[PDB]
């Protein structure tokens, strides 16, 4: 996200990775969905399963990865890209933990770009704008 | 190992061995049996994907669950849309049943696929009606699992294609169903070739009186054909 | 707001080269000084941390090795315009910086002086890679000294030098304002060990303190 | 498998794979870069051994820990005695981080080695002083681990050499650090090349409100040189 | 000769020669231009069929008709269902225009396909709105056919891909349109690549004051792609 805001036009596939960080005996299932651009984000688990999805049992497999095929938004002044796609997660089952593991278990997500990812038309990043000891390099 | 089929994928770590029902793998309709409706069309992917049902709660007083195929899928996705627009169909099935238990849960499940499970009703002469049979995605519950709700026995239900889930050894089961009919095509809205039954032979148990295990059913149509329409 | 989309047809990796990502002539210093014969001349310690956007681009790395292409763009404004000679003198580390307009350090036989007029194209020189080490430390997890606040983050081998700019002309009956814009373009850039971008606003020039 | 190095040995059973920082293995100073102080002397063993620090207590409200190298070792053993008698040094590092948890503990740690982690202070203009940086063997604690205490982000801290410890999958982490400087030698008492940071991204958990996991850090100087002295 | 394409067929006896627009036949997206959305999916038949519109009544005071592509097909059949579910598309077009006249009718039609016919409004500064452009299957009527409703001329409209229907010589016209865009894919609900315009240059005539000729438009998407979705 940060390196792409130095550029105007971006393009390519991305790489999500979700890591389950519960206990060893925590079990359950998730539906990780991919909604393409244009399509509506699912609101139910059943609509979620009808799309491109992953039924991920995290009872033994702690990490799952998913290729995001080709988002590719840009910058417009004549206005944003807005909706270019969604990754959505639903509970297929309940979280099943033993009575000595914690009730609450956490997921973390990762994103990387793939080798087809490309950036174009370098601009200024909007992230940090403008302080102390500034005029010390002059006196 | 992942069960990848279409844009659906069942992403697990442990799944040992499938059951191939009657040793038969699902193939398409061969070019000597198709004297009928000319060249039954094949989407080849659009139906052939896992349809993961709503999970059922296994508890200590569970008698069992059943889904009828293709009635469990006749209103779901591109399978269920092709069922409403087409008149004939032919499909096998990949069924994956999975349990979410810890090493402190116990219990055994007979996961059995029954060809043409004509059901009986209990303590009456009237046949089961339409709503007593065609339950859809929700499926049904065994009233008397010991007789398989048809006057037979559950003890001999291993004559059918079956898998055991003993929570010591495994939590998953895979049955691969071929086309099971006396006709090459059939009529999906009014006849079922398979009933997937999941029956707890040994009931569920841990100590704190409210032991509960998710059971998840994923059904994939295999080699699913339909009549022409063009 | 209105929401749009376009089919994007891209191929190639050449614009995200670190040479292309960093070699542009950026404004690194801008001062006014009045003139009537460090007041009354331009003196700037050559850093990269004056403006926060070049600072955040270069703090994407741990080590940088580059030559600096310094362009000096002087405009005048009276308090027409006479044609004035300016001396820009690069004073490296180890040389002595002027403190007056008429100091003898402007007569430097060893410092790189450039003499140029307002009517000319902007003065442009290339300061080489000046460091004692193989790269500039963009970050420095150490101290410049140990004796009573030898400051943290300061590396003695990172000092480019000073860019001292005066007016070679003598006093005039007219009074005028000299604005010196200094443009730096890093050249022949090698970069090492990329870092997370800064997410919080900078508080000081000399350190990495954060307000949150 | 044992991490045997010197008269020190880390005797474990499970350790899967090291992280080699920037793909670079620590080597000695090559014979074209040593134009400097003539033939920097090598004890070859006397420093090159594991220095196992005092274990830190990971709990639910832990924000994280950091050690600066070689500041964490400048008063320990034959490394720390050579730091006080020598003026220059050059070394890589083998770092082994280990957790002692059961299968009922949960939590994730980002074990990250940061080259030249210049720290910032919070809500002030004054730089961090000497005592705010040079913590020694005890190390420091992250005040704001989400910004890595330097205004950046923790989310992007995987741009550095890092390892994950997810207590489901692993409890150990090994990072092999090369020499990381713009100079071939440096000055161990007043500049740090590496900061080993251990930050809990997912906090620790079990049921009984006082869950606690030991984290043990073992640092070995690799290919550790020093100036002549004779 | 029959124009057979899919389960649609235009079964005629006389159709002399098509117009191939700019000499280009519609092909699929080649494997060097598809750097974009990966492998744009092809139904290969399900859209590629004739969609025969409602016939228009040509009379003596007719000024002309226009349909915008693919706006004329965005709510029709499996093309229009794929337009509502997909985000991108790429298609050429086969257009067959046909007249039903006797040998006592007279009149000439310019059947012209205009690439990116941006329309103007008459006697105002406001642009045409959405309802003034996106007419769908019904299409629109030329207000001022002499300027082509865009400030240009109809006399020079033969610079575009065109066919003449002179009711002495022919009553049918076939234009084969390739993909006409500066991008390889585009967005079917909000941009039109082609406008099929049918304009009577010589008006219709017989004696009894109410001369009327059916004009039938059949549009087939050719080589119609869409983005993946899986």
The full DSSP string for D129-174 is -STTT--TTS-EE-SSGGGTTTTS-STTGGGSSEEEEETTT-SEEE
DSSP-derived 3-state class of residue C186:
strand
- Cβ-Cβ pairs closer than 8 A, C with E, add up to 16
Tokens of B114: 């029954």
Residues of A in contact with C206 (CB under 8 A): 133, 136
Contact yes or no for B192/B69 (Cβ under 8 A) = yes
DSSP-derived 3-state class of residue C106:
helix
Contact yes or no for C27/C51 (Cβ under 8 A) = yes
Task: Give the chain B residue nearest A57 (alpha carbons).
Answer: B12
Distance CA E54, CA E51 (A): 10
Nearest CB to E86; choose among A13, A38, A52: A38
Query: Could you tell me which residues are beta bridge partners of residue E162?
Result: E112
Tokens of A12: 């390519």
**Cis bond leading into B70, ω under 30°?**
yes
Residues of D in contact with A110 (CB under 8 A): 158
Residues of B in contact with E6 (CB under 8 A): 230
Of the candidates D222, D178, D227, D226, the one whose C-alpha atom is nearest the C-alpha of residue D8 is D222
Nearest CB to A69; choose among E85, E86, E228: E228
Query: Is E43 touching B (CB cutoff 8 A)?
Result: no
Q: Cα separations (Å) of E3 from D176, E50, E64, E166, E223?
A: 71, 9, 25, 21, 16
Beta strands in E82-187 (DSSP E): 89-99, 106-115, 140-141, 162-166, 172-177
Chain C residues with CB under 8 Å of a chain A CB are 1-6, 8, 10-13, 15-16, 20-21, 31, 38, 43-45, 47, 50-53, 56-57, 60, 196-206
Tokens of A39: 């399509």
* H/E stretch holding A46: helix A45-49
Contact C7 E88 (CB under 8 A): yes
Query: Is B210 touching E (CB cutoff 8 A)?
Result: no
Burial of C125 (0-12, 13-18, 19+ CB in 10 A): middle
Distance CA D30, CA E172 (A): 85
Tokens of C201: 């606003």
Distance CA A133, CA B13 (A): 57
Residues of A in contact with C1 (CB under 8 A): 79-80
Distance CA C106, CA B38 (A): 98
DSSP state of E71: G
Distance CA D107, CA A108 (A): 11
Contact A96 B216 (CB under 8 A): no
Contact yes or no for D98/D48 (Cβ under 8 A) = no
Query: Is C156 touching D (CB cutoff 8 A)?
Result: no
DSSP-derived 3-state class of residue E157:
helix
Number of alpha carbons in the 13 Å side-chain half-sphere of residue E69 = 31
Calculate how close chain E gets to B79, using CA atoms only, in Å: 14
- Domain at B1-230: CATH code: 2.60.120.20
Query: Is C11 touching E (CB cutoff 8 A)?
Result: yes
Q: Is the dihedral of CA C90, C94, C99, C104 positive or negative?
A: negative
Residues of E in contact with B6 (CB under 8 A): 230
* H/E stretch holding E2: strand E2-5
Mutate to test the interface with C, among E187, E188, E193, E227 (most CBs of C within 10 A): E187
Distance CA B57, CA B62 (A): 8
Per the rule left: phi > 0, alpha: psi between -120 and 50, beta: everything else, B68 is beta
Contact B100 A53 (CB under 8 A): no
Contact C10 A73 (CB under 8 A): no
Contact A125 C45 (CB under 8 A): no
Contact C209 D118 (CB under 8 A): no
* Residue C178 CB neighbour total at 10 angstroms: 22
Contact yes or no for B184/B178 (Cβ under 8 A) = no
Q: Is the dihedral of CA E151, E155, E159, E161 positive or negative?
A: positive
Query: Is B51 touching A (CB cutoff 8 A)?
Result: yes
Non-local CB neighbours of D44 within 8 Å, separated by 6+ positions: none
D106-115 and D162-166 strand pairing: antiparallel
Query: Residue C145's Cα: distance from chain center in Å?
Result: 25
Calculate how close chain B gets to A7, using CA atoms only, in Å: 32
Contact yes or no for B145/B199 (Cβ under 8 A) = yes
Contact E228 A38 (CB under 8 A): no
In chain B, where are the structural domains located? 1-230
Give the chains touching B; criterion: ≥3 Cβ pairs < 8 Å: A, E
Burial of B104 (0-12, 13-18, 19+ CB in 10 A): middle
Residue in the block written with tokens 């045409």: E128
Residues of A in contact with B214 (CB under 8 A): 28-29, 92-94, 96
Non-local CB neighbours of E82 within 8 Å, separated by 6+ positions: E43, E46, E47, E89, E226
Residues of A in contact with D168 (CB under 8 A): 20-24, 26, 62
Residues of C in contact with E35 (CB under 8 A): 9-11
Contact yes or no for E83/E76 (Cβ under 8 A) = no
Contact D167 A25 (CB under 8 A): no
DSSP-derived 3-state class of residue D92:
strand
Calculate how close chain A gets to B84, using CA atoms only, in Å: 17
Q: Write a three-state SS string for chain B.
A: CEEEECCEEEECCCCCCCEEHHHCCCCCCCCCCCCCCCCCECCCCCCCCCEECCCEEECCCCCCEEEEECHHHCCCHHHHHHHHHCCCEEEEEEEEEEECCCCCCEEEEEEEEEECCCCCCCCCCCCCCCCCCCCCCCCEECCCHHHCCCCCCCCCHHHCCEEEEECCCCCEEEEEECCCCCCCCECCCCCCCEEEEEEEEEEEECCCCCCCEEEEEEEEEEEEEECCCC
Distance CA C108, CA C105 (A): 5
Residues of C in contact with D33 (CB under 8 A): none
Per the rule left: phi > 0, alpha: psi between -120 and 50, beta: everything else, D69 is beta
Contact yes or no for D63/D129 (Cβ under 8 A) = no
Beta strands in chain D (DSSP E): 2-5, 8-11, 19-20, 51-52, 56-58, 65-69, 89-99, 106-115, 140-141, 162-166, 172-177, 194-205, 213-226
**Cis bond leading into E70, ω under 30°?**
yes
D172-177 and D19-20 strand pairing: parallel
Of the candidates D187, D174, D222, the one whose C-alpha atom is nearest the C-alpha of residue D74 is D187
- Find the DSSP H helices in chain C: 18-22, 52-58
Query: Is C205 touching D (CB cutoff 8 A)?
Result: no
Beta strands in chain C (DSSP E): 26-35, 42-45, 63-78, 85-92, 112-117, 123-127, 136-137, 161-167, 176-192
DSSP state of E210: -
Per-window interface: D 60-89 vs C, CB < 8 A: 68
Residues of A in contact with D167 (CB under 8 A): 21, 23-24
DSSP state of E21: G
Nearest CB to C50; choose among A79, A122, A137: A137
Calculate how close chain B gets to A85, using CA atoms only, in Å: 16
Distance CA C128, CA C67 (A): 5
| Domains in chain C: ranges and CATH | 1-212 (2.60.120.20)
Task: Give the chain E residue nearest B5 (alpha carbons).
Answer: E230
Non-local CB neighbours of B188 within 8 Å, separated by 6+ positions: B70, B71, B74, B83, B86, B89
Nearest CB to C199; choose among D22, D147, D180: D147
Burial of D125 (0-12, 13-18, 19+ CB in 10 A): middle
Query: Is D75 touching A (CB cutoff 8 A)?
Result: no
Contact yes or no for E164/E111 (Cβ under 8 A) = yes
Task: Give the chain A residue nearest B9 (alpha carbons).
Answer: A54
Contact yes or no for B86/B79 (Cβ under 8 A) = no
Calculate how close chain C gets to D227, using CA atoms only, in Å: 18
Contact C139 D121 (CB under 8 A): no
Query: Residue D109's Cα: distance from chain center in Å?
Result: 14
Distance CA B149, CA C74 (A): 96
Contact yes or no for D171/D101 (Cβ under 8 A) = yes
Of the candidates B52, B43, B135, B132, the one whose C-alpha atom is nearest the C-alpha of residue B90 is B43
CA dihedral B188, B194, B195, B197 (to 10 degrees): -150
Calculate how close chain B gets to E46, using CA atoms only, in Å: 8
Distance CA E26, CA E219 (A): 14
Calculate how close chain A gets to B92, using CA atoms only, in Å: 20
Distance CA C47, CA C152 (A): 17
Query: Is D30 touching C (CB cutoff 8 A)?
Result: no
Question: Any contact of B with A, at least 3 CB pairs below 8 A?
Answer: yes
Method: cryo-EM
**Cis bond leading into D70, ω under 30°?**
yes
Q: Cα separations (Å) of E71 from E86, E175, E180, E189?
A: 15, 18, 15, 7
Give the chains touching A; criterion: ≥3 Cβ pairs < 8 Å: B, C, D, E
Tokens of E127: 């642009």
């Amino acid at each position: 996200g940060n390196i792409s805001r130095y550029y105007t036009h971006w393009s390519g596939s991305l790489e999500m990775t979700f890591m389950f960080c519960g206990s060893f005996m925590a079990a359950g299932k998730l539906i990780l969905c991919y909604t393409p651009p244009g399509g509506s984000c699912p609101t139910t688990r059943e609509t979620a399963m009808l799309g491109t999805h992953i039924v991920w049992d995290f009872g033994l497999q702690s990490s799952v990865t998913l290729i995001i095929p080709w988002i590719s938004g840009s910058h417009y002044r004549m206005s944003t890209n807005a909706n270019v796609g969604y990754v959505t997660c639903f509970m297929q089952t309940n979280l099943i933990v033993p009575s000595e593991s914690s009730d609450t278990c956490s997921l973390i997500g990762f994103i990387a770009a793939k080798d087809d990812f490309s950036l174009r038309l370098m601009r200024d990043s909007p992230d940090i704008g403008q302080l102390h000891a500034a005029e010390a390099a002059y006196q | 190992l992942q069960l990848k089929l279409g844009n659906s994928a069942i992403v697990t770590q442990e799944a040992a061995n499938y059951c191939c029902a009657y040793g038969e793998w699902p193939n398409y309709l061969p070019d000597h049996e198709a004297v009928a409706i000319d060249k039954p069309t094949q989407p080849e992917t659009a139906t052939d994907r896992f349809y993961t049902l709503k999970s059922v709660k296994w508890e200590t007083g569970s008698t069992g669950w059943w889904w009828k195929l293709p009635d469990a899928l006749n209103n779901i996705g591109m399978f269920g849309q092709n069922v409403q627009h087409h008149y004939l169909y032919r499909s096998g099935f990949l069924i994956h049943v999975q349990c979410n238990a810890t090493k402190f849960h116990q219990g055994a499940l007979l996961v059995v696929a029954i060809p043409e499970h004509q059901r009986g009703a209990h303590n009456t002469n009237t046949s089961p009606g339409f709503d007593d049979i065609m339950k859809g995605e929700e499926g049904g519950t065994f009233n008397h699992p010991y007789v398989l709700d048809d006057g037979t026995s559950l003890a001999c239900a291993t004559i059918f294609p079956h898998q055991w889930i003993n929570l010591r050894t495994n939590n998953s089961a895979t049955i691969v169903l071929p086309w099971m009919n006396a006709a090459p095509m059939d009529f999906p809205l009014r006849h079922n070739q398979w009933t997937l039954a999941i029956i707890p032979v040994v009931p569920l148990g841990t100590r704190t009186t409210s032991s509960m295990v998710p059971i998840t059913v994923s059904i994939a149509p295999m080699c699913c054909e339909f009549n022409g329409l063009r | 707001a209105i929401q749009t989309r376009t089919v994007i047809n891209q191929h190639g990796v050449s614009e995200t080269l670190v040479e292309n990502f960093l070699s542009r002539a950026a404004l690194v210093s801008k001062r006014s000084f009045e003139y009537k014969d460090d007041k009354n001349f331009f003196k700037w310690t050559i850093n990269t941390r004056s403006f926060v956007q070049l600072r955040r681009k270069l703090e994407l790395f741990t080590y940088l090795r580059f030559d600096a292409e310094i362009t000096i763009l002087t405009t005048v404004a009276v308090n027409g315009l006479p044609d004035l000679t300016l001396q820009a003198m690069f004073v490296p580390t180890g040389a002595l910086t002027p403190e007056k307009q008429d100091s003898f350090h402007w007569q430097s036989g060893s410092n790189a002086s450039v003499f140029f007029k307002i009517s000319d194209p902007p003065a442009r020189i290339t300061i080489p890679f000046m460091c004692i080490n193989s790269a500039y430390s963009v970050f420095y997890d150490g101290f410049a000294g140990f004796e009573k606040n030898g400051l943290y983050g300061i590396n003695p081998a990172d000092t480019i030098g000073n860019l001292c700019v005066r007016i070679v002309n003598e006093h005039q009956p007219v009074g005028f304002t000299v604005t010196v814009r200094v443009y730096m373009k890093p050249k022949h850039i090698k970069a090492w060990a990329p870092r997370p971008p800064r997410t919080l606003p900078y508080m000081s020039i000399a350190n990495a303190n954060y307000k949150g």
